[PDB]
Design an enzyme around this catalytic site. Structure first.
Site, short mmCIF file in Angstrom:
data_model
loop_
_atom_site.label_atom_id
_atom_site.label_comp_id
_atom_site.label_asym_id
_atom_site.label_seq_id
_atom_site.Cartn_x
_atom_site.Cartn_y
_atom_site.Cartn_z
N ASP A 16 0.86 -1.22 -0.03
CA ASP A 16 0.08 0.16 0.00
C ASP A 16 0.91 1.19 0.11
O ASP A 16 1.57 1.58 1.09
CB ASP A 16 -0.86 -0.04 1.15
CG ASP A 16 -1.64 1.10 1.39
OD1 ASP A 16 -2.21 1.60 0.22
OD2 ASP A 16 -2.36 1.38 2.37
N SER A 30 0.14 15.96 -11.57
CA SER A 30 0.04 15.54 -13.22
C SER A 30 -0.13 16.93 -14.02
O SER A 30 -0.91 17.83 -13.56
CB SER A 30 -1.46 14.51 -13.37
OG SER A 30 -1.38 14.33 -14.76
#
Length: 329
Positions: free
Chosen positions: A35, A198
């Site tokens: 994770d 991004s």
């Protein structure tokens, strides 16, 4: 040193991926959810309330290398509402042939119902930054943090498969596992995550919109959670898609051929195939399917979960100034 381990979807929907982890001496092999969105290595254990165990457990009293970390406790809660808590051992932990000694192994006294209900997940192995670890009074280092001194390079890579096995590598970059080159982007650790920005997105064969999308790379989240406006632009290109209040997100006809979704990494582009965005039927045999791209409005953070990450070869560069790399594959 290096390690290389195979990671496998837990079910037909790619809800999560499990990776074998060897704990203790002699090794007890547990399948853990790696994770990158948390920082605790915790396991079902012989300490866990019996009615809450349905999983393979870690028994510290069967490990000659287990040491109780005196006075230490932990308690964690995850975005999906799951939780667990307990006490802490240090022990030898190996992943894919890479061994760390003195790793904190958080033994659950209790687990929430969602964990009891999932027979395939025996615990979690967190790979976010150690500032998010929940042990008190002194936080504990992640497996990766403890491994860096010995690794050939302070990196790990995630190569998750679409309904297929994949790989986690520690300490090296397999240049045969991706196409083109890796583009690296800056990481902020101010919130403890592999947080990056991004450069924008495109839907299908349409135009790339330059829009900063701050989000986290999280192998332990199933779906791709993006801003509401971005998600709406995607599902506008799917003629049967609608948001469903009762189901809890966008649903669409399973027979649709979905457009791809492209996200920017610097000047580079990662293309998620349309098929990856079909998460699967809302029930077996349904005509309706749940979307793999959903709005992040309700959870308040954008999350590049498995729907996105499984379309890329992802490099988690844990140098003193960390960076995140993406390559097509």
């Amino acid at each position: 040193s290096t390690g290389s381990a195979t990671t496998t979807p837990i079910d037909s929907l790619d809800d999560a991926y499990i990776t074998p982890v060897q704990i203790g001496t002699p090794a007890q092999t547990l399948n853990l959810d790696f994770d990158t969105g948390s920082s605790d290595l915790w396991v079902f254990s012989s300490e866990t309330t019996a009615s809450e165990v349905x999983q393979t457990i870690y028994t510290p009293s069967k490990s000659t290398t287990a040491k109780l970390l005196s006075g230490a406790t932990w308690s964690i809660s995850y975005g999906d509402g799951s939780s667990s808590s307990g006490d802490v051992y240090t022990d030898t932990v190996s992943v894919g042939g890479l061994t760390v000694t003195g790793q904190a192994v958080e033994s659950a006294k209790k687990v929430s119902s969602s964990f009891t209900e999932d027979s395939t997940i025996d615990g979690l192995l967190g790979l976010a930054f150690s500032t998010l670890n929940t042990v008190s009074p002194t936080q504990q280092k992640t497996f990766f943090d403890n491994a860096k001194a010995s690794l050939d390079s302070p990196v790990f890579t995630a190569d998750l498969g679409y309904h297929a096995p994949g790989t986690y590598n520690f300490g090296f970059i397999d240049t045969t596992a991706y196409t083109g080159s890796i583009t690296y982007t800056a990481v902020s650790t101010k919130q403890g995550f592999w947080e990056w920005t991004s450069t924008g997105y495109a839907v299908g064969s349409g135009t790339f919109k330059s829009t900063s999308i701050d989000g986290i790379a999280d192998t332990g989240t199933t779906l791709l959670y993006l801003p509401a406006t971005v998600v709406s632009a995607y599902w506008a290109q799917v003629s049967g898609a609608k948001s469903s209040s009762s189901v809890g997100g966008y649903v669409f006809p399973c027979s649709a051929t979905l457009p791809s979704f492209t996200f920017g990494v610097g000047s580079a582009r990662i293309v998620i195939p349309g098929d990856y965005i079909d998460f699967g039927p809302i029930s077996t045999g349904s005509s309706s399917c749940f979307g793999g791209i959903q709005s992040s409005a309700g959870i308040g953070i954008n999350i590049f979960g498995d729907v996105a990450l499984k379309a890329a070869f992802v490099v988690f560069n844990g140098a003193t100034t960390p960076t995140l790399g993406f390559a097509s594959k």
